[PDB]
Design a protein around this ligand. Structure first.
Ligand SMILES: [Mg+2]
Ligand SMILES: [Mg+2]
Ligand SMILES: [Mg+2]
Ligand SMILES: [Mg+2]
Lengths: 436, 436
């Protein structure tokens, strides 16, 4: 039984406040922390901020923490909920809020409770978190599936300097034999990329972006990609490392068109592209580089562009801001055949149950699922256990730098070690890892 | 009763492998992770690295991990040692090694066991880690003392781009009334610094260094300091935030001279300053800026230079590479009156006991003690509990960015909350928090 629910303000990887929740039962104290994105989709559940300019640059989460201690906490404890019944836990929270976008209490007030409950439940059942998460999602645990790590080693986009339009340039060691090998390979390629970057762009270009990757002032994606390929070869891993991209095109979508130089206040409007035009650029890159996944190639509501492209894509197309981990929007994407993979962010929807539902609906449509972190992370490692529990076979949780990223990668090392031969590495089968 | 000692490889904040140890008792499994420095003093205890340039860039810790599972673990379990008796735990580890620098098993093999044992001990005693650390060190606990955080918000030095010689430019919110307020104030100054840095040196200059601070291409300490002071003021905290520096001068000490532009090959040897000349520069910075602490102003063995400067320093002078948390070198420093504050790094010496002894000898000499992280950190939060347990009143664990730094700051927030009226904030008394 839950004897206490408590929330406090903690700081995320960018130094901004965020919500941390502790749930107390007879088994102890279970803590979960809520992450925060930067390029947040317009349809994401509401992240409640105080807006007090005289404090934390106006990014305090006092209202959210208060919503947990003064509203959720008393009602939750009184309800005497069974933490093992994740569905009941979340139906209560969703009803308590009473809004579709969780704007009354705030998604960042609700999620912490939702996640902490699952941890308390796992301890009650006397099983590790990933196992409990497999049960909740009715996932196969014989054997488990380890995910291929998609490491964002080179950063571009809105909050990542330069003129580079595309947000993320990830490497995926699909050729590795184990997760531990994939991670070692990833670290070697990353270190080789830092040395090459520092030499070609200056020592300063060695500093990292929010997610841990280098962020040199590069102009075109071609330049970045050619640089990544040199790193893979210099590191001696040619043939084992593939590439994944997160375009986050919603960030440069204006007047129904795409500005690939949006970080330039004097961008040439006659240079902005239409959906069909942008698609042609993607195809050109896809033919020159070992790209096996493309995320948010088009705007969060530009359905036509997604459908047109998917027609001749040929590779995994990941929906992030388009679907915002929302089953309702996912059903639409399926019907319109806009993509074949879901980027799963628990904080985009607000509860563990809704996230699991989103995953299940995706796997049912033959879609893949890549569990994801947010640009603003914490020392919390929930997604590591989640990606294993959901048996997706693919996760992106940062470059192999900055511990809000390494914390998840290390947890996967422990889970892998603990499972032994009771688990397999998704490798080249990352897309349909759930079907292994 | 310890039934198992185990070690594995995990990644630090720079993506380099490091040692993680778990100790199993009837109370459960306790994990501790070993940190790693970059500007390591020549006298530090040995950090055993594999040296296989084909794996992890040659930074593997397979040998150290093996020594834990193959040499340490077997004998430790058989000895049936009492985890509460920290001194007994460390005498065994030190004796098993046999070398004066822990070069047989490696300091990174011994430390993990030393720390994990203390966590297990606190569990057996059913008390918070900081409480058990206070007992081990015989420190006052009525009331507890929370530290002022020295946040390295602007980085330079060897492992940073640019030409800035000094390694760390820290801010310390001594004017705050609680640790929570100090952290908020620090986060605010940090963010104002970020925007200002990007506005002057370019958006790309917003990327962070290994310790989370901005690392723009700055030529002189004055330019860096003026920038920090502009941030403090823009944030509205003028007068409440002081400055601390880590020169790490051993990094640019050549031919008995100090090169303030050692990062440039064609550096004019004519500009190299002598011991007395470097001192004049420091006094100059001290009268111009609100600097309340200077670390490693002179080389790790340049004793006379330290003694001469200290005669008229007027502020806290911290020893890092000079003393390397070694009681024997601390004694020499005291006798020579070279400094009045010790930077305490548990991995510079190798065990918790020796670290505790170093702190005790320091306080007995009227010295201050600043607990410190390494440039290569992890999700481990041991030093948060250590600084509170030692009642020092001051710690440096990074800028308020990158979770290997925030993990510690967040842990201090939890400690402060738990203690309530039973703890006080060091504030302007940071130098002698132990006397509060
Ligand atoms: Mg986004
Ligand atoms: Mg995205
Ligand atoms: Mg150093
Ligand atoms: Mg130092």
């Amino acid at each position: 039984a839950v004897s206490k629910v408590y929330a406090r303000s903690v700081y995320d990887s960018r130094g901004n406040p965020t919500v941390e929740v502790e749930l107390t039962t007879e088994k102890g104290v279970f803590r979960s922390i809520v992450p925060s994105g930067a390029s947040t989709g317009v349809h994401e559940a509401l992240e409640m901020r105080d807006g007090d300019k005289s404090k934390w640059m106006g990014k305090g989460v006092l209202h959210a923490v208060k919503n947990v201690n003064d509203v959720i906490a008393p009602a939750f404890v009184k309800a005497n909920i069974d933490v093992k019944d994740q569905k009941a836990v979340d139906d209560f929270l969703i009803s308590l809020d009473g809004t579709a976008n969780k704007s009354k209490l705030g998604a960042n007030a609700i999620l912490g409770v939702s996640l902490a409950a699952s941890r308390a439940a796992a301890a009650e059942k006397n099983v590790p978190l990933y196992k409990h998460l497999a049960d909740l999602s009715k996932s196969k645990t014989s054997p488990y599936v380890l995910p291929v790590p998609f490491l964002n080693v080179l950063n571009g986009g809105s909050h990542a300097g330069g003129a580079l339009a595309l947000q993320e340039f990830m490497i995926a060691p699909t050729g590795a034999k184990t997760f531990a090998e994939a991670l070692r390979i990833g670290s070697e390629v990353y270190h080789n990329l830092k040395s090459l970057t520092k030499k070609r762009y200056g020592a300063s270009a060695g500093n990292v972006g929010d997610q841990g990757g280098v962020a040199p002032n590069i102009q075109t994606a071609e330049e970045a990609l050619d640089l990544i390929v040199d790193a893979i070869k210099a590191a001696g891993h040619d043939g084992k490392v593939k590439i994944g991209l997160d375009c986050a095109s919603s960030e440069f979508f204006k007047d129904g068109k795409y500005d690939l130089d949006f970080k330039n206040p004097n961008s040439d409007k006659s240079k902005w592209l239409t959906g069909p035009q942008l698609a042609d650029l993607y195809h050109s890159l896809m033919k020159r580089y070992p790209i096996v996944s493309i995320e948010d190639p088009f705007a969060e509501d530009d359905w036509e562009a997604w459908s047109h492209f998917f027609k001749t894509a040929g590779i995994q197309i990941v929906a992030d801001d388009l679907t915002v981990t929302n089953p309702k929007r996912i059903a639409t994407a399926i019907e319109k055949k806009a993509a074949d993979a879901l980027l799963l962010k628990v904080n985009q929807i607000g509860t563990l149950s809704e996230s699991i539902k989103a995953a299940q609906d995706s796997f049912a449509a033959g879609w893949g699922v890549m569990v994801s972190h947010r640009s603003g992370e914490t020392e919390d490692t929930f997604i590591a256990d989640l990606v294993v529990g959901l048996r997706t076979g693919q996760i992106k949780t940062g470059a192999p730098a900055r511990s809000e990223r390494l914390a998840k990668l290390n947890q996967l090392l422990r889970i892998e070690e603990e499972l032994g031969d009771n688990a397999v590495f998704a490798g080249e089968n990352f897309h349909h890892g759930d079907k292994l």
